[PDB]
């Protein structure tokens, strides 16, 4: 009935024309069964399982095309499918890492409260199995270290999949943190020693850092001058708020009175 | 013996004298909280009698 | 995650969307709080045929958030679909609030006494005498005089 | 047989004395309290009603069975009847059944016999004034009846009891509405009953639609009539919403309000417990530590029993993530100690600076944490263990070598020795200045700013709190 | 500290003596 | 009370914190303190 | 009536909410009038 | 009937409203 739907899934798509045609094909299903709340007769959710597969690859095509709003839309759809009020559904082979795509992207956005509340659905299951989720939680463990280097050892080997597009964003968002977290405050760091973390050989990223930081560029070495930095005293600056706090404090004494 | 205040050095052979005499301002507060203990303890008897 | 489905260009999905909202809005009243900003697009668009009904779900979510005058704002430009429903609880709350607004505005209007009058929308004043016809039809005579005391007119 | 045969008669008349005059003096007193004063509420027999429900809930409940006093279920639900001058004869009929049970054997009719019994307040036609007296006379057998937990064929009678209660709720919404005062005595009952809803639904199926009904009730209280009801409805929401993902976190911000005034007493503090775990999921401890501590100091006097101990189980979690924790055996209870033994070894190894000591406890004692669902802390606590170790070593050593510090903390490599300190400086953990040549790490002790900033910030809390004690004393002092 | 020292004492005498003189004096009248 | 939630489910303590520090660290200790003498 | 019998439920609710608010303000006035009775007693002792 | 009392119950609201100013001012002068 209806279809042809999954025929374009094995072959995937050469361009975004067939993908847009897949969304236009799914628009008819979205006009008939819509998205919810059809309980049934749960056999009416069978074509919704067949729609979950092409929505999973709809997020693989949303990250393949790099589009951010498309990715979050399709992920809202999948997440709501595993959040459907009927928990009895055929097991999806992608159910595991499809939470890790949005989790690693969410980590690229730096969302602390949503990370922990994401895993709140199955706390004991994410630890015992699903290696695809065990990589981001080991990444969080390594983010309180932080890493930096341990993550660079784990970034060589990832299954992954599709995390290539996300680990590039993770790359840049770590590399600027090398520059931010090295100083303040270190007295000095030798040249090749920082070259060991920036990798490459003689990158222009360290020249752009010689601009961005500024900060200092010294011969065969580097310096946090001057000095460590800005030298807060703060002398008579805090005496203003020290008088000010006592103003309203005396006001509280007068409110008693 | 506390009759003399300072500090020595075995290596450099240096004795240094330092003194900060007054202890009065803390005695002020310390001897207060120590008695306020029995203050609150004495309040528990009335607070226990009014309730039960 | 039904909020992200509002990113679709075709309005034919928007009618189905609002059809999901009003059905699950009792539990999902809080789920529309962060979507208000996306509701502004549907209400502010004149080529959107369902803006009349978009203001209904907006007024409901502002009922959940405790917004009164803000629900009146969408109540006005919500069209005929808004005042056509006299059922259940939501109809009495909005006319109590709208007549309170209307009667303080009318005590102000009688204090002009004329000239530089404030603009009076035909909808907010039309539901006045329109729902007053209920007191004439039910023949209840105590309320019939009360409304005329309220508007001062 | 002779001994037990003579020990059967004495028990049944003990309730048939007290339980007969209990809701007759409390319900019959609240009958005249409901006609006038009616200020506020108060209705002090509503508080007495809390005491009476909790009175039977220890002894003797309703029944059983027991083949003796099981006839009280149809007795009090019969004979309204009907208007107040006609109720005198019925109050006498209640006493005629005492001679019936004293002469012949007592008749037991329950289970399938309860269907016409619960419909007899609708058959009498009618009470007709007090819906809460009929809700109490119908619930008072039903509420301890849940203690049977037979789960077969009488749970659908509990569903019929929610349906009959919903009939009484249509009568609760339609009638009055102007100086209702029946709603304020019924909001305690709508509370307890809705908690019994979730209680019964926990033994069969979670309630997705009953939350639609509950939220209809919830939002419909504001603004028309809400007294004490919505504070309980929000906790009904939060109770299964905390156990059931998701989004319910930011749901509270759009609900508040607050909702004031806080009621009923400790009932608000427990709400602070639920939202305390919630706000802990956002990792903010300063907001979480106060809401947790307030829960315990706002709850007297117990017993009973173990939930007041569990709220303390989660109390010190946020303090353990803080990094500053008091020793928890000062709150040690003989019934609580036995329950947190594994947990106590957890905090014991947490305050230490050894990382391997901490990783052993999760392996051996994780099986208990699965039941509490407390694994959310175990991933984020490691950050606090390493920060604790580095804090110790920071103050306790003037100059420390980065290569030699890794062996004590099992840091295992030179490279992360720089990382811990890097973020330590970034978060303001240690003021030490570090030189990378070999490299080495030196530390310095700075003070004298000290008592300038810290005590005045505390004083701002101290004095404000003392004047609040003054205001709360003046408030209760001016009443005479 | 002296402030908070006597603040609790004021609340002591006031609340203790008043709550007693409130409920124990009212119970004999009614 | 017992209403609502709860039916659903000097002193020596201050020094007992330090004693907890002694429980998981360096035993008490006599024997090791006497064993460290002849090691070197 | 729907205008009405149930819309006068909100209307007269303003009576009950004003009387409840005013019962709080009247409790705040009663407990404060005890002040004036007492301070007038204190003014009466110096005359005594 | 209904609107009659509706306009009858803000009277004591305003009467006690000026009563607040009454009690508050009088105790302040009575202290002097």
| Residue from the list C7, C10, C16 with its beta carbon closest to the beta carbon of A73 | C7
Query: Measured at the alpha carbon of residue D422, what is the angle toward residues D285 and A199, in degrees to the nearest 5?
Result: 130
For A9, other C-beta atoms within 10 Å of its C-beta total 14
* Residue D65: DSSP 8-state: -
Q: Are strands D433-435 and D399-400 parallel, antiparallel or unpaired?
A: unpaired
| Residue from the list F9, F13, F17 with its beta carbon closest to the beta carbon of D306 | F9
Euclidean distance between CA atoms B30 and D90, whole angstroms: 72
Contact D478 G23 (CB under 8 A): no
What is the enclosing helix (H) or strand (E) of D441?
strand D440-442
Contact D77, D138 (CB under 8 A): yes
List C-alpha distances in Å: D315 to C8, D297, D320: 46, 11, 9
Contact C143 G9 (CB under 8 A): no
Nearest CA in chain E to B35: E5
Query: Which tokens is C150 given?
Result: 């309220």
The closest alpha carbon to D333, from D302, D364, D358, belongs to D302
Chains that touch E (3 or more CB pairs under 8 A): B, D
**Bridge partners of residue D434, in order along the sequence:** A186, D441
Name the burial class of residue D28, with classes exposed (0-12), middle (13-18) and buried (19+) by CB atoms within 10 angstroms of its CB.
middle
Euclidean distance between CA atoms C81 and C50, whole angstroms: 10
Helices and strands (DSSP H and E) totals, chain D: 22, 3
Residue the block writes with tokens 């931010």? A180
The closest alpha carbon to D441, from D476, D473, D461, D411, belongs to D411
Contact A94, A160 (CB under 8 A): no
* Residue D435: DSSP 8-state: E
Name the burial class of residue A73, with classes exposed (0-12), middle (13-18) and buried (19+) by CB atoms within 10 angstroms of its CB.
buried
Query: Which tokens is C52 given?
Result: 């009349």
List C-alpha distances in Å: A208 to A179, C101, D322, D401: 11, 62, 38, 32
For chain H, the residues whose C-beta falls within 8 A of a C-beta of chain C are: 1-3, 6
Residues contacting D337, CB < 8 A, separation 6+: D344
Query: Which tokens is D114 given?
Result: 């309860």
3-state helix, strand, coil in chain G (%, to 5): 85, 0, 15
Is chain D in touch with chain G: ≥3 Cβ pairs within 8 A? Answer: yes
User: Hey, is the C-beta of A154 within 8 angstroms of any chain D C-beta?
Assistant: no
List C-alpha distances in Å: A31 to A50, C20, C135: 16, 13, 44
Contact H16 G43 (CB under 8 A): no
List C-alpha distances in Å: C136 to C129, C139, C144, C147, H1: 10, 5, 7, 12, 17
Euclidean distance between CA atoms B31 and A127, whole angstroms: 55
Query: Which tokens is C151 given?
Result: 């508007």
3-state helix, strand, coil in chain H (%, to 5): 90, 0, 10
Contact G13 D177 (CB under 8 A): yes
| Phi, psi angles (nearest 5°) of residue D230 | -70, -30
The closest alpha carbon to D270, from D304, D330, D241, D312, belongs to D312
The closest alpha carbon to D69, from D23, D119, D114, D110, belongs to D110
Contact C78, C59 (CB under 8 A): yes
Dihedral sign of CA atoms A74, A75, A76, A78 in order: positive
Could you tell me the resolution of this structure in angstroms? 4.4
Euclidean distance between CA atoms A182 and D434, whole angstroms: 11
> Which of helix, strand or coil describes residue D428?
coil
The closest alpha carbon to A18, from A34, A31, A4, A2, belongs to A4
Report DSSP letters for C100-138, one per residue. Answer: HHHHHHHHHHTTS-SSSPPP--HHHHHHHHHHHHHHHHS
For A110, other C-beta atoms within 10 Å of its C-beta total 8
* Residue D434: DSSP 8-state: E
Query: Which tokens is A76 given?
Result: 């809202």
Residue the block writes with tokens 């301002």? B25
Contact D258, D214 (CB under 8 A): no
Please report residues of E whose CB lies closer than 8 A to that of D476.
15, 18-19
* Residue B14: DSSP 8-state: -
3-state helix, strand, coil in chain C (%, to 5): 70, 0, 30
**What Rg, from alpha-carbon coordinates, does chain D have?**
30
The closest alpha carbon to D280, from A112, A126, A108, A122, belongs to A112
Residues contacting A224, CB < 8 A, separation 6+: A183, A184, A185, A186, A187, A188, A215, A216
The closest alpha carbon to A57, from A39, A45, A75, belongs to A75
Query: Which tokens is D340 given?
Result: 């947190």
Residue the block writes with tokens 């006005």? C76
Starting at the earlier edge strand, list the strands of the sheet with D399-400. Answer: D399-400, D440-442, D433-435
Residues contacting F8, CB < 8 A, separation 6+: D307
Q: Could you give the dihedral angle defined by the CA atoms of residues A155, A160, A162 and A167, in that order, rounded to the nearest 10 degrees?
A: -10
Please report residues of D whose CB lies closer than 8 A to that of G36.
none
Euclidean distance between CA atoms D463 and A254, whole angstroms: 12
| Residue from the list B29, B39, B40 with its beta carbon closest to the beta carbon of E1 | B29
Contact D179, D125 (CB under 8 A): no
**Bridge partners of residue A186, in order along the sequence:** D434
List C-alpha distances in Å: C147 to C131, D89, G7: 10, 48, 12
> Which of helix, strand or coil describes residue B41?
helix
Contact C131 G5 (CB under 8 A): no
Nearest CA in chain D to A146: D419
Contact D348, D317 (CB under 8 A): no
Contact D285, D318 (CB under 8 A): yes
Contact E16 B50 (CB under 8 A): yes
Q: Which of C142, C147, C151 to mutate to test the interface with H (most CBs of H within 10 A)?
A: C142
Euclidean distance between CA atoms C125 and C142, whole angstroms: 21
What is the enclosing helix (H) or strand (E) of D400?
strand D399-400
Query: Which tokens is C53 given?
Result: 């009904």
- Angle of helix D248-255 relative to helix D229-243, nearest 10 degrees, comes to 170
Contact D279, D238 (CB under 8 A): no
Method: cryo-EM
> Which of helix, strand or coil describes residue D171?
helix
Query: Which tokens is B19 given?
Result: 């003194």
Secondary structure of D81-114 in HEC code, one letter for each residue: CCCHHHHHHHHHHHHHHHHHHHHCCCCCCCHHHH
Residues contacting A230, CB < 8 A, separation 6+: none
Contact G3, C137 (CB under 8 A): no
G20-30: b (≥16 Cβ within 10 Å) or e: bebeebeeeee
Query: Which tokens is F27 given?
Result: 């035993």
Helices and strands (DSSP H and E) totals, chain E: 1, 0
Peptide linkage before A160 cis (omega within 30 of 0): yes
List C-alpha distances in Å: A122 to A76, A82, D250, D363: 18, 12, 20, 19
| Phi, psi angles (nearest 5°) of residue A230 | 75, -15
């Amino acid at each position: 009935m209806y279809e042809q739907l999954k025929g374009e899934w094995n072959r995937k798509s050469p361009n975004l024309s067939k993908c847009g045609e897949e969304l236009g094909r799914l628009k008819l299903v979205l006009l008939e069964l819509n998205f919810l709340p059809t309980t049934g007769t749960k056999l009416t959710k069978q074509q919704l399982i067949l729609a979950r597969d092409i929505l999973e690859i709809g997020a693989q095509w949303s990250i393949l095309r790099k589009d951010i709003p498309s990715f979050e839309r399709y992920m809202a759809q999948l997440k709501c499918y595993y959040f459907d009020y009927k928990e009895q559904l055929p097991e999806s082979a992608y159910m595991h890492q499809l939470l890790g795509l949005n989790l690693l992207f969410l980590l690229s956005q730096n969302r602390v409260a949503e990370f922990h509340t994401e895993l709140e659905r199955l706390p004991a299951k994410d630890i015992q199995t699903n290696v695809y989720i065990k990589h981001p939680v080991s990444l969080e463990q390594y983010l309180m270290e932080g890493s930096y280097n341990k993550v660079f050892l784990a970034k060589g080997n990832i299954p992954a999949e599709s995390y290539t597009f996300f680990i590039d964003i993770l790359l840049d968002t770590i590399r600027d943190e090398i520059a931010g977290c090295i100083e303040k405050a270190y007295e000095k760091i030798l040249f090749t020693e920082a070259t060991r973390i920036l990798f490459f050989n003689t990158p222009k990223k360290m020249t752009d850092y010689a601009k961005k930081r500024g900060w200092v560029l010294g011969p065969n070495n580097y310096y946090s001058f001057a000095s460590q930095q800005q030298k807060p005293e703060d002398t008579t600056i805090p005496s203003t708020e020290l008088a000010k706090q006592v103003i309203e404090y005396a006001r509280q004494l007068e409110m008693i009175v | 013996d506390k009759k003399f205040h300072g500090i020595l050095d075995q290596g450099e052979g240096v004795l240094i004298i330092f003194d900060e005499p007054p202890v009065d301002k803390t005695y002020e507060a310390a001897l207060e909280t120590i008695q306020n203990m029995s203050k609150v303890v004495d309040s528990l008897y009335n607070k226990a009698k009014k309730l039960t | 995650g039904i909020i992200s489905l509002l990113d679709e260009d075709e309005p034919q999905l928007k009618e189905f969307a609002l059809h999901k909202l009003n059905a699950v809005v009792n539990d999902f009243w809080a789920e529309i709080s962060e979507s208000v900003d996306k509701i502004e697009v549907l209400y502010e668009d004149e080529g959107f045929r369902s803006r009349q009904f978009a203001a209904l779900v907006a007024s409901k979510v502002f009922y959940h958030l405790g917004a009164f005058e803000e629900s009146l704002n969408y109540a006005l430009g919500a069209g005929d679909l808004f005042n056509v429903n006299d059922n259940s609880e939501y109809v009495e709350t909005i006319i109590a609030k709208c007549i309170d607004h209307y009667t303080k505005q009318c005590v102000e209007n009688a204090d002009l006494p004329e000239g530089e009058k404030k603009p009076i929308d035909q909808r907010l004043e039309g539901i006045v005498n329109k729902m007053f016809q209920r007191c004439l039809d039910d023949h209840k005579y105590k309320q019939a005089i009360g409304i005329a005391l309220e508007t001062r007119r | 047989p002779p001994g037990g045969g003579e020990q059967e008669p004495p028990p049944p008349p003990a309730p048939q004395d007290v339980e007969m005059k209990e809701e007759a003096a409390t319900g019959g007193g609240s009958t005249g309290e409901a006609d006038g004063k009616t200020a506020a509420a108060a209705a002090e027999h509503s508080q007495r009603e809390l005491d009476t429900v909790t009175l039977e809930d220890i002894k003797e409940h309703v029944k059983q069975l027991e083949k003796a006093v099981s006839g009280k279920e149809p007795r009090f639900v019969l004979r309204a009847l009907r208007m107040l001058p006609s109720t005198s004869r019925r109050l006498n009929h209640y006493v005629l059944y005492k001679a019936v049970q004293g002469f012949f054997t007592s008749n037991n009719a329950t289970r399938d016999f309860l269907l016409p019994f619960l419909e007899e307040p609708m058959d009498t036609e009618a009470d007709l004034q007090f819906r809460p007296r009929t809700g109490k006379a119908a619930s008072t057998p039903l509420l301890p009846e849940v203690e049977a937990y037979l789960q077969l064929l009488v749970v659908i009678f509990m569903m019929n009891s929610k349906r009959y209660k919903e009939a009484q709720k249509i009568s609760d919404d339609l009638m009055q509405k102007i100086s209702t005062q029946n709603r304020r005595a019924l909001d305690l009952v709508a509370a307890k009953c809705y908690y019994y809803h979730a209680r019964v639904y926990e033994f069969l199926d979670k309630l997705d639609v009953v939350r639609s009904f509950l939220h209809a009730r919830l939002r419909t209280a504001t603004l028309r009539h809400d007294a004490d009801g919505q504070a309980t409805l929000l906790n009904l929401l939060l109770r299964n919403y905390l156990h059931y993902s998701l989004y319910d976190q930011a749901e509270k911000l759009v609900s508040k309000s607050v909702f004031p005034e806080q009621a009923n007493n400790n009932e608000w503090a427990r709400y602070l417990y639920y939202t305390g775990r919630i706000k802990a999921i956002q990792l903010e401890y300063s907001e979480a530590r106060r809401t947790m501590t307030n829960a315990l100091r706002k709850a007297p006097q117990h017993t009973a029993v173990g939930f007041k101990q569990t709220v303390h189980k989660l109390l010190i979690v946020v303090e353990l993530l803080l990094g500053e924790i008091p020793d928890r055996l000062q709150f040690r209870q003989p019934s609580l100690k036995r329950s947190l033994m594994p947990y106590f070894l957890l905090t014991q190894a947490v305050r230490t600076g050894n990382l391997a000591k901490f990783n052993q406890v999760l392996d051996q004692f994780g099986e208990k944490f699965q039941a509490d669902g407390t694994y959310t802390l175990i991933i984020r606590l490691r950050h606090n263990v390493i920060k604790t170790g580095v804090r110790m070593i920071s103050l306790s050593y003037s100059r420390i070598s980065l290569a030699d510090i890794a062996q004590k903390l099992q840091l295992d490599s030179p490279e992360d020795a720089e990382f811990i300190v890097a973020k330590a400086i970034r978060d303001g953990v240690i003021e030490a200045s570090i030189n990378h040549e070999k490299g080495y790490v030196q530390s310095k002790e700075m003070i004298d700013i000290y008592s300038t900033r810290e005590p005045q910030l505390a004083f701002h809390q101290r004095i404000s709190f003392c004047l609040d004690i003054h205001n709360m004393s003046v408030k209760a002092m001016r009443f005479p | 500290y002296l402030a908070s020292l006597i603040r609790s004492v004021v609340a002591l005498h006031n609340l203790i003596n008043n709550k007693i003189a409130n409920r124990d004096a009212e119970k004999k009248e009614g | 009370m017992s209403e609502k939630k709860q039916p659903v489910d000097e002193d020596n303590w201050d020094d007992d914190n330090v004693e907890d520090d002694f429980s998981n660290q360096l035993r008490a200790e006599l024997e090791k303190h006497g064993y460290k003498m002849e090691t070197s | 009536l729907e205008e009405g019998k149930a819309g006068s439920g909100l209307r007269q609710y303003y009576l009950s909410k004003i009387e409840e608010l005013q019962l709080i303000v009247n409790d705040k006035s009663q407990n404060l009038r005890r002040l004036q009775a007492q301070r007038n007693e204190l003014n009466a002792k110096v005359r005594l | 009937d209904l609107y009659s009392r509706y306009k009858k119950l803000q009277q004591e609201l305003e009467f006690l409203e000026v009563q607040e100013e009454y009690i508050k001012d009088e105790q302040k002068n009575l202290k002097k």
